[PDB]
Design a binder for this molecule. Structure first.
Ligand SMILES: CCCCCCCCCCCCCCCCCC(=O)O[C@H](COC(=O)CCCCCCCCCCCCCCC)COP(=O)(O)OCC[N+](C)(C)C
Ligand SMILES: CCCCCCCCCCCCCCCCCC(=O)O[C@H](COC(=O)CCCCCCCCCCCCCCC)COP(=O)(O)OCC[N+](C)(C)C
Lengths: 392, 392
């Protein structure tokens, strides 16, 4: 833990705090209500979810290292240059500084020639360039490993599914709103944005063509084909076929939600039965993922609970109360997770859908933040598939 | 070096940087030229000089610890809770955050009932309360020791002059502008400020009564009586009587400057001879302090220079170039130091005097910042009076 790294973490955090406060007062006072800000909120929602995910991942690394979870061995990382929680805090703070600067430039641009629509373009282009720059520049090893993971995950059936690919695909499953906002950004730029004055003032916000439904299922598709690949490598059905079944319930729920969405403005009598199928598959998907979490992901509700009631025997975290609020928050937010996926899969809430999505996506990142703790603790305690060698 | 301390240093530094930038744009755009801002600049000049002194003192502690200067033994500090450079950076950043917040409130006050003249009052009252709070609150040991020093320095003839009293009196000699702005603050509040609207829109800025001349000589008076006390304790004249002579040259230069100032508006023919005496004593004071610096304070220009030309034999700092720019900057700024004392002692520059003082006081703090390095290095190498036991 070098002193300059901690100093950079504090410096970036302080600049981020003051820039967030400035953003707040700018929104109340400087921001004008004439311009529609929803596309801006969607683009910067994708950015903010990425930064929040990095910050919560830093907290996750802190918890793993100071609880005993050997995440370095589980992630199959070299125990020489593994990213510490401080480095994740530094990256999150730096990208948050860029995000806040881009947002402030969108509110008031202190440049006469530069237009407003380039600040999101410049911000996300800077994220991409920082990720893919060939030179041995900041954190070269970390982003090279991350880029290899991003290549292996998005081409799943052709690579053996290790722990890192599975984990990253699940994080993308929680961060599907980032892909959704990226697709919305591309569609808005290509179709709806007038490259004349600004990004304020749309066909890309509905399911006229249903492309973002494929985008929504993309992380579920990667996880589905990863489970199928694991079945192909190891001819066993209990973990992998049932997990792929869970992801296919996500598939059916999303597509039935989309069918109901297009059928409202259409008007066939099959709309009511498409509803009924939607609640059926919504309940199936929500309970499937929730029971999978508590039983196979977290490992709780074991029959060897002992003193730790409604939990497992071995526990590495200090307070059982943490496990209990984790269970409660998982039950609450898994239904909200399916709800937000459903409304993002439909167009029937053009009044509240945007706000409920914008306030539930950070809660979904927080759910996966809590999910990481107990998932990797369960993997550390007893192997779940991806070790095949020892318990640790 | 705890991680949280470095994090706090970085956090305070980042907030300070962003608040300084915000202050800059507020001054260019938000600030209105109708209100006179000179009293505001004087009050916050005192505050800013204190914060700059703390930051440069942190740099001094860094240099002393990583060059070999045993400042803990020289300052007669307990080697258990001695303030590190990080703690000084933390204090400077925190007080700078308060200073920036008070200045921003003076520019735009987001409170309808609270008037503008309380933000400097609240800021300096908070500094005083932080310094003198009886409870074992932040840095209790450090400020208790500092308060004991502040008591021993301001009552000099009745205490034996140790190194810490001498050093602090010299720092106050460099920071006499802080006392000047404090006296101006008190006079402005008691006489010129109308407690109706604000502090903007004076008899306290001239020498109608000549009280701030006594304030200017107060640090020189403390050093003068400290040298006399050291003569009384040790009956030797070469160091102490000559040093007291130097401080008395400061006395004569200040009082002759004041006499010339009052005699311009008076109009006697003795004004020209008071001028002539002023340049005589200005040159005497400037060369006295400058030669004292290089010869007795820093110890340079020794006859055992050897390879280190125009310097001394033993050198703890890496590059001799540092010593050379230090000599050049000392020759340049000692004349500027006497110049700023003279114009603050007079009223003949009511056009440029305020600005030259406001830009030379930070340069005077920087001169004492450079002076600390070589003074305590000289004391570390060979004893100068205040050891009497060993060379170290
Ligand atoms: C509208 C929204 C548009 C969004 C824009 C597109 C997204 C921009 C993408 C760029 C931002 C991501 C910044 C990169 C941070 C990655 C840091 C990282 O991966 O640290 C990890 C830390 O190691 C760990 O596994 C512990 C914590 C788990 C790390 C999980 C990976 C982080 C995933 C975050 C990016 C996900 C991509 C999101 C795309 C939407 C890699 O470690 P290392 O490489 O340094 O050490 C391994 C040893 N070697 C290297 C030798 C093999
Ligand atoms: C208009 C302008 C008005 C200005 C307002 C009035 C000024 C406000 C005054 C309050 C601000 C000062 C904040 C206090 C910081 C002091 C920190 C400090 O003294 O650290 C020092 C660090 O120790 C050192 O000696 C090394 C560096 C040299 C320290 C020099 C003292 C600092 C002087 C700064 C204040 C000067 C006062 C200025 C008044 C104008 C004390 O160490 P310690 O007490 O923690 O450890 C010693 C062991 N014991 C305690 C057991 C004996």
């Amino acid at each position: 833990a070098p002193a300059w790294t901690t100093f950079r973490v504090g410096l970036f955090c302080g600049i981020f705090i003051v820039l967030n406060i400035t953003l707040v007062l700018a929104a109340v006072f400087k921001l004008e209500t004439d311009r529609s800000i929803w596309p801006l909120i969607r683009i910067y929602r994708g950015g903010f979810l990425l930064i929040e995910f990095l910050f919560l991942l830093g907290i996750n690394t802190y918890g793993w290292r100071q609880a005993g979870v050997n995440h370095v061995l589980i992630f199959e990382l070299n125990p020489r240059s593994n990213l510490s929680h401080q480095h994740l805090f530094e990256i999150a703070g730096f990208l948050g500084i860029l995000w806040c600067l881009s947002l402030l430039a969108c509110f008031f641009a202190p440049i006469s020639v530069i237009p407003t629509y380039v600040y999101p373009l410049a911000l996300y282009g800077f994220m991409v360039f920082f990720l893919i720059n060939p030179t041995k520049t900041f954190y070269y090893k970390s982003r090279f490993w991350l880029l290899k993971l991003l290549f292996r995950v998005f081409t799943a059936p052709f690579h053996k599914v290790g722990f890192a690919d599975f984990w990253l695909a699940d994080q993308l499953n929680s961060l599907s709103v980032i892909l959704m906002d990226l697709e919305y950004m591309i569609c808005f730029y290509s179709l709806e944005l007038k490259w004349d004055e600004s990004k304020g003032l749309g066909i890309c916000h509905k399911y006229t063509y249903g492309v973002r439904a494929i985008v929504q299922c993309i992380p579920a598709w990667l996880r589905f084909i990863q489970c199928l690949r694991r079945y192909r490598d190891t001819k066993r059905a209990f973990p992998h076929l049932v997990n792929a079944g869970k992801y296919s319930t996500t598939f059916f729920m999303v597509t039935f939600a989309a069918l109901y969405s297009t059928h409202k403005e259409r008007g066939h009598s099959d709309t009511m039965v498409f509803f009924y199928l939607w609640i059926v598959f919504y309940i199936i998907s929500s309970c499937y993922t929730l029971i999978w979490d508590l039983k196979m992901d977290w490992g709780l509700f074991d029959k060897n609970a002992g003193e730790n009631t409604f939990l497992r025997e071995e526990i590495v975290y200090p307070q059982k109360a943490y496990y209990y609020c984790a269970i409660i928050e998982d039950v609450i937010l898994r239904f909200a997770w399916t709800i937000q996926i459903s409304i993002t899969s439909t167009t029937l809430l053009p009044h509240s859908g945007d706000i409920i999505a914008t306030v539930f996506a950070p809660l979904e990142v927080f759910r996966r933040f809590v999910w990481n703790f107990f998932r990797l603790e369960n993997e550390h305690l007893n192997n779940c598939g991806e070790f095949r060698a020892v318990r640790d």
